[PDB]
Homo-oligomer: 24 residues x 4
């Protein structure tokens, strides 16, 4: 696997979750 | 990879929800 | 990789650009 | 892939700047 792509994917999922919960 | 795919869809979805949240 | 990953990449670059500009 | 690497770097930077901007 690609460490950078894994980290960016996880960070991206976390980003949407935190943004949603912030907008609620 | 299901992670890469899921994060790809989630990334596209994130921009959509952001634009609509801003407009 | 595939057109999904490409599209999400382009869309992620676009997202940061538009967020920075919307934030200025 | 260059585009994927750049988007990975940009995605990480995006979250960091968003969190900070929000605080
Ligand atoms: N919000 C971003 C959009 C771009 C990606 C990170 C999250 C996403 C997951 C991986 C694979 C591509 C490029 C980045 C890494 C699509
Ligand atoms: Cl915002």
């Amino acid at each position: 696997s690609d460490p950078l792509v894994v980290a960016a994917s996880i960070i991206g999922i976390l980003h949407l979750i935190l943004w949603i919960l912030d907008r609620l």
